[PDB]
């Protein structure tokens, strides 16, 4: 893969406008609602039997903040996402056994959340740059499986 | 599959607020820009060499409207989508050789467009209902392949 | 979907030459080794820390037999697989939260086992018929999710 | 990703036993039969309306030889598949617009062909190493899309 100058500017600029205290909870909660099977990894977070219980769960909100903060840090290292996520790859693959397909699923739900918050600013080109980011993150986090 | 009565209500209600004349071209054009390989099915549609050419292309806008008007008719048959799409399955599978993976891709681009147009109104539960609709439509259209 | 009379004949004839007592453990064990993340669904099955432990594990062999005996019964109902697998869909979706992508994965590991056991006899046309069967079984088992 | 010493030895040793004058035609032909949509890229090869016509087509056999010869060369460069396939990535993505999902589809059909020819020698571990190879090749060839 390869980010263009335009890709980097679009990723960096849009991300600077995200609130990583609500976006993270919103993204992980939406993943858990829309694709229910993912709840299996988070049986320690409490009751996730309904949308309201998930979107209102403080451990979901707290953990989504970690997720997006680590992604925000990675956006400082676009040309080296493999190395930047090496340690989290080890955690997610070797220790938690998260299905590699889930990384792209979460990335697509972040794209949905960006489209909700930014609307018409999320043009096809802007979405293309973010789809490249989703793919790249998923590859970096599944590296230990490959 | 199975649509709950709440899935049907969501699907029909949100669709009634969709302007097909705008959403059609916006959905097909977004698919062509974001996932460029799909342009190979539309060589006769003329200039697709840049995002601005795709989003300005009269044939892309006219075709997207056909697509979304076909999906509007399908929403009147939610609990018989395979029978509803039998003719278009034959067209897309036996005659055009569309990759079944692309039906899922276009339905995901429509989810993105709905998120852009409705923002917050596109809640996690509303997205779940539409995610089941995209899957159901993909399955119905690739039925000739199965 | 749709099974041709030649798909049914292929499926039933090749299956009649399959030894389930061997193929069962061989298929589940291959899935656990090749796609290690799926081991997380089988923590109670004991030692799955190495390929030799998985392929020697008595619980994996006993479970694989259940799996393949379930698929043998399904082959007697090829043109009603969704109804046939309704109970196991509820089990795998509502109770175990299996990722629908893993049903496709296991059916692909079975294709590999059939290729190993039958060699040349597993022609391109015979594989096509079995590829439709894996897809049909995945769709039927993930039906609760749709 | 990362090949282990064991991965490299397994890939290199099994590949040294493949016949790249028949395996290539067998792999591309099987892809065209099993997953019909792929035939769309090869409308220049002649009649592909049936298994017999595909498996007997001299242009299929001739082109599959190219495919596997380029893969054989890549197996000399396991630690640098991105650079080794850079030029073919440009051809397949920028010029032919091949769907990225097809690269993994072809890789899985090569795995089926290896299982047919090598049988019990294709153990779960041996298949794991080859699945890692399939993923890595698909990533290298789709790089221009990412
Ligand atoms: C954008 C991709 C993702 C990133 C950046 C990410 C990041 C993180 C981080 C930073 C942690 C915390 C580790 C610590 O606290 O030391 C974590 C834990 C975890 N992640 Fe992820 N993650 C990602 C995707 C996923 C996906 C797709 C899954 C499964 C669907 C997943 C499941 C988990 C689990 C089960 C934990 C342990 C949490 C606990 O102990 O309660 N993650 N992740
Ligand atoms: C939401 C899924 C889809 C639906 C509901 C849909 C619906 C339609 C309909 C109704 C037509 C007929 C147009 C007319 O009568 O002139 C059509 C034509 C076509 N569709 Fe789709 N389609 C879908 C997905 C796809 C995808 C994923 C592709 C491939 C990237 C595709 C490629 C085509 C092509 C090439 C035509 C013929 C266009 C022309 O040259 O006239 N469709 N589709
Ligand atoms: C070819 C697709 C599959 C079929 C036909 C199938 C069939 C079965 C059947 C018949 C049982 C019941 C066993 C008994 O009565 O004791 C079962 C249990 C189960 N299956 Fe599947 N299954 C399939 C795919 C999967 C996949 C992809 C996974 C996840 C990696 C999975 C995870 C499980 C689990 C965790 C159990 C419960 C086992 C235990 O703890 O007792 N299955 N399956
Ligand atoms: C293991 C992965 C693959 C490799 C190593 C590979 C390699 C090659 C090579 C060496 C060529 C010849 C270029 C030349 O003659 O200068 C080629 C051409 C081509 N490939 Fe691939 N390929 C791969 C996968 C694919 C897939 C998945 C598709 C689509 C399903 C595809 C479609 C094509 C087409 C359409 C051509 C042009 C052939 C013609 O002009 O008639 N390839 N490939």
């Amino acid at each position: 893969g390869h980010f263009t100058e335009e890709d980097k500017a679009t990723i960096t600029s849009l991300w600077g406008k995200v609130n990583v205290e609500d976006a993270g909870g919103e993204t992980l909660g939406r993943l858990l609602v829309v694709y229910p099977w993912t709840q299996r990894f988070f049986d320690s977070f409490g009751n996730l039997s309904s949308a309201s219980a998930i979107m209102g769960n403080p451990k979901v909100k707290a953990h989504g903040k970690k997720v997006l903060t680590s992604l925000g840090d990675a956006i400082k290292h676009l040309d080296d996402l493999k190395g930047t996520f090496a340690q989290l790859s080890e955690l997610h693959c070797d220790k938690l056994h998260v299905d590699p397909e889930n990384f792209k699923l979460l990335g697509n739900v972040l794209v949905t959340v960006l489209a909700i918050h930014f609307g018409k600013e999320f043009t096809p080109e802007v979405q293309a740059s973010w789809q490249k980011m989703v793919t790249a993150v998923a590859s970096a986090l599944s590296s230990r499986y490959h």
Side-chain angles (χ1 to χ4, degrees), chain A:
Chain A
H2 169 69
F3 290 104
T4 73
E5 287 295 346
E6 287 80 349
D7 290 327
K8 296 179 180 179
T10 281
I11 289 163
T12 296
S13 184
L14 197 65
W15 184 249
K17 305 173 186 182
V18 173
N19 171 75
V20 176
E21 187 45 76
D22 299 305
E26 288 170 64
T27 299
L28 177 54
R30 187 166 286 265
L31 175 79
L32 298 164
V33 175
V34 184
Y35 306 109
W37 52 95
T38 59
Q39 306 175 186
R40 163 67 102 98
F41 289 100
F42 310 95
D43 258 290
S44 75
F45 283 29
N47 170 49
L48 309 172
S49 49
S50 60
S52 198
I54 291 173
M55 304 309 293
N57 187 296
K59 294 175 80 167
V60 170
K61 180 180 339 330
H63 186 70
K65 175 179 177 179
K66 299 178 187 182
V67 180
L68 265 61
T69 296
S70 287
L71 186 73
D73 185 78
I75 286 177
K76 299 178 180 65
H77 312 260
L78 297 175
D79 284 336
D80 193 13
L81 291 182
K82 181 182 74 295
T84 302
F85 272 122
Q87 176 271 157
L88 286 177
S89 181
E90 186 191 331
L91 172 65
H92 288 83
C93 302
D94 289 312
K95 309 156 192 172
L96 298 163
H97 276 332
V98 170
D99 179 338
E101 198 57 38
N102 297 315
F103 296 130
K104 105 163 183 176
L105 191 53
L106 177 54
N108 294 308
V109 169
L110 176 64
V111 167
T112 301
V113 170
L114 297 176
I116 289 175
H117 246 285
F118 294 106
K120 323 67 210 56
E121 198 180 328
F122 205 64
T123 57
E125 296 170 280
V126 162
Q127 186 187 342
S129 298
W130 276 94
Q131 287 304 336
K132 185 176 287 181
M133 177 70 180
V134 170
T135 294
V137 171
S139 171
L141 282 175
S142 69
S143 192
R144 276 290 308 156
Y145 288 129
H146 308 140

